[PDB]
Write a protein that binds this DNA or RNA. Structure first.
Length: 273
DNA sequence: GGAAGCGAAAGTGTCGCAACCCGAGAGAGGAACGATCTCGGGTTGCGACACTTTCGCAACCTAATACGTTCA
């Protein structure tokens, strides 16, 4: 149900906590069944929370560009409400859909209905809400030779032609106010411009100055200190599993790094882990 | 959304301090009746605070889960 959620805190990698609301099991299954019953329109540029297309593809969409820009939607999930969903459906019996889809974080606000990050159905509705937003933004971008993707609160644009992304921020805002009234809003504090002169990266994947995806020198040094420790067996159980997971991540994003690590010490060492 | 306590921002009220008036009063200095100089109550102005009010920061999480990573 809308109130059938459980709230908790998960910490942050630097300081502070984040508040999550995982649904109950029965409504979890009900919303999964609803997701299966009707598939929602989704734009290709939304390379997040879909089969196959992962972080690597979203970051590689901008590999072959030298000027990078992006903005972060302010309070993405919690802004979506019944009105946004139904306007999106109309633009292209219904009360139980409202009940199943949404969350009520306040005991008194029966109408304060929003998507939670925990909800397994939240990704599908989030992608569905911006089907025309992505349509128009990508149409404009490709009209001006701009590659645009969105990793779920990370609207990324890239291009090679100088002084074109400058108008893109404003564009975004305008379109937003046409589509979702004035409810969902951008985060002007996070908007970042970068070039081949600074530290570009999309969704955590670094983009080096040679138009290839990379783990970044930071990690490439961190999980090689970890490997040098494993060489002398100075890790632990959880730490060793952490190194294994990080090596798997580096294999997925930058297989060349794994090959070079193998050449560094051996093949059997990484088969062991 | 927001408790508990605290403080910012703003607005209104208090209240010394000053300015000024208006009678009194001993008595110029020489001519009587007394200019001037003061001693007081008392009223009004006038701005520096002092108090009153509202806003807004952000604690908390009967309903989870519990191989390791990444990423919203």
């Amino acid at each position: 149900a809308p109130r059938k959620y459980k709230v908790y805190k998960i910490p942050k990698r630097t300081t502070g906590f984040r508040v999550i609301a995982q649904p109950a099991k029965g409504l979890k299954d009900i919303q999964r069944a609803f997701v299966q019953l009707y598939n929602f329109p989704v734009h290709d540029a939304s390379m997040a929370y879909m089969k196959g297309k992962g972080i690597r593809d979203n970051a590689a969409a901008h590999a072959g560009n030298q000027y990078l820009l992006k903005a972060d939607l302010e309070d993405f999930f919690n802004s979506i409400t019944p009105a946004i969903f139904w306007r999106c459906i109309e633009m292209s019996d219904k009360f139980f859909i409202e009940k199943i889809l949404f969350w009520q974080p306040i005991k008194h606000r029966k109408t304060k209905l929003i998507l939670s990050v925990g909800a397994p159905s939240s990704p599908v509705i989030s992608n569905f809400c911006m089907y025309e937003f992505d349509n128009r933004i990508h149409a404009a971008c490709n009209k001006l030779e701009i590659t645009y993707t969105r990793y779920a609160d990370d609207l990324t644009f890239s291009c090679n032609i100088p002084n074109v992304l400058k108008a893109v921020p404003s564009t975004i805002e305008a379109l937003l106010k046409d589509l979702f009234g004035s409810e969902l809003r951008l985060n002007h504090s996070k908007t970042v411009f970068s070039s081949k002169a600074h530290n570009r990266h999309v969704t955590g994947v670094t983009i080096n100055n040679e138009e290839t995806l990379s783990l970044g020198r930071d990690r490439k040094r961190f999980i090689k200190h970890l490997i040098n420790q494993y060489k002398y067996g100075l890790l632990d159980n959880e730490d060793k599993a952490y190194l294994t997971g990080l090596l798997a991540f580096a294999s997925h994003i930058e297989p060349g790094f794994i090959t070079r690590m193998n050449e560094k010490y051996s093949l059997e060492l990484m088969e062991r882990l």
